[PDB]
Amino acid sequence: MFINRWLFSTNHKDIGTLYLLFGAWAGMVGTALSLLIRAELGQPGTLLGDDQIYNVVVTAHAFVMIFFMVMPIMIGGFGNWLVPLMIGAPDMAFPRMNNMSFWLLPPSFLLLLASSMVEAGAGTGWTVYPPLAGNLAHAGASVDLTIFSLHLAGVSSILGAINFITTIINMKPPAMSQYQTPLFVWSVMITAVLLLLSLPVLAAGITMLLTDRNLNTTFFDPAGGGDPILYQHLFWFFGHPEVYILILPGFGMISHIVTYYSGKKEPFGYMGMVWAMMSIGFLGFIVWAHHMFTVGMDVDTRAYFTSATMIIAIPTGVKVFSWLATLHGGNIKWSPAMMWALGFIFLFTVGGLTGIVLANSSLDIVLHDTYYVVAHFHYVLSMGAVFAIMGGFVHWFPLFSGYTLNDTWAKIHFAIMFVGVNMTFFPQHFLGLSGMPRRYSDYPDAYTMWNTISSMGSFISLTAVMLMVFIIWEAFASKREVLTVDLTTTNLEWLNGCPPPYHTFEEPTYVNLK
């Protein structure tokens, strides 16, 4: 019974719930790791020890938050939960395969946990670049385990990418065109395509790294004629699409949240919005090298990559401005989710603006490998991707559970986290302009002030993620059942009540062919 339901599932709703549960827990581990990082940097000196134990921590932080919290939650959680409901499908195209996608995750996570236990773990950076990641500077099972964890996580994500594209394309009502599906669905259909094309190149890269250190190959070893830079190309070819794969579903949720709380029927410029994500997804494939400005490449190619990278601002701009245009004549409701949506719009703008700066190779020479880049991506990840997750979570919680959250508490939670993340990452812009490198367990005396303030902010964030856990408990402890939902005419996900039954759309949906 429990087994059949929870271990042998073929239900998009239950698999989606299983994901959210996996993502939340992984989110705890990643938070703990981020605290050890700021604990180590909150006072001049060494708390843990050498850059090895420290960088092992920094590496797990990245893998956990990227592959185990953000991706599972947005794509597996919201993806599986909402997609079928938004297009009127009974389930997904491949219910069984969908389950394997999920179950591949816990093992993948185990391998990553195991890696930091055996030997001295993997202090290579999330980019696990060779020669440091090689069998000399990093002998032992650790890196190999890190590689296998990544293989599984990749197999999991492209299997799911296959499911979402097939479902989304093949399972909509016969009269509904693609230009009739909601932005969130488009958002995951496009993210699914990026995963399908980038993930395999990564697997090609790390498999080459695996043979280099166990089978005596020399793909990245100069001795045999290899090239450590070749790994950089392969990794980053996936590495960039990967960050868009991380923000796109967030773009979608934001479009849904802003529109709903503005009391609007639809988002402003729907086709412009579809065009924008498609452009973003595409340009995202031809700019990888901006991560290699100080590697010794030709000035000309270095010029190409700074330009190509900059044009991504245009489409992203039409999206920011569209969400604003959406708020326009709206009847605004200051709900928790709307608060998260507004924060995202601003904070993400700042963080992406800061990324345009780094787009310049000349300036990037002095900005690369410093805390400026740590600020850039935490703005777009800690107050971009994450803010979307929170807005979507508080907005759809009633649909998933049937129960409601205490809005006041939910608002307190935003206030605390908003202060925390800004205090944590704002100072870091300075540390980076002033020269503080990345991946250091200690720094010259001058960087003491900002690092201190920065670490204090991380404690406020800790407070907020603790409160959230409680906020979820209370919701489930009180049991206020949902009664009425607004704007369902334009929001299908809610039409079957909270929570929708195990089997929805048993009998299709009627859509006329005008």
Binding site: G88, P173, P174, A175, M176, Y179, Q180, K265, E266, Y270, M271, T488, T489, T490, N491, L492, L495, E507, P508, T509, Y510, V511, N512, L513, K514
Partner: protein, 98 residues
């Protein structure tokens, strides 16, 4: 070349596959594979929404190029109208179900 020996759908198709196969040749569509064609939608010529129960979700693409489908439950009883454009829809019992 020359010869024979492989089964055909008409002779080897089973389950739901066969059901839609036959149903399809009689011109009927019990498993909603095709897009329902609209009527004039007037109070007197409502769109007839077949159903296997007493309510079915209707999605109304008000105007041809619309990107937003208006959704709502159509119940057993008097004809009902799309909230954004009138257009009558009336529930009807679903015949063929095997």
């Amino acid at each position: 070349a020359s010869g024979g020996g492989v089964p055909t759908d008409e002779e080897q198709a089973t389950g739901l596959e066969r059901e839609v196969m036959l149903a399809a040749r009689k011109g009927q569509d019990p498993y909603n594979i095709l897009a329902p064609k609209a009527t004039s939608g007037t109070k007197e010529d409502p769109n007839l929404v077949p159903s296997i129960t007493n309510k079915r979700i209707v999605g109304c693409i008000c105007e041809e190029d619309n990107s937003t489908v208006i959704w709502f439950w159509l119940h057993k009883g008097e004809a009902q109208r799309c909230p954004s454009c009138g257009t009558h829809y009336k529930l009807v019992p679903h015949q063929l179900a095997h």
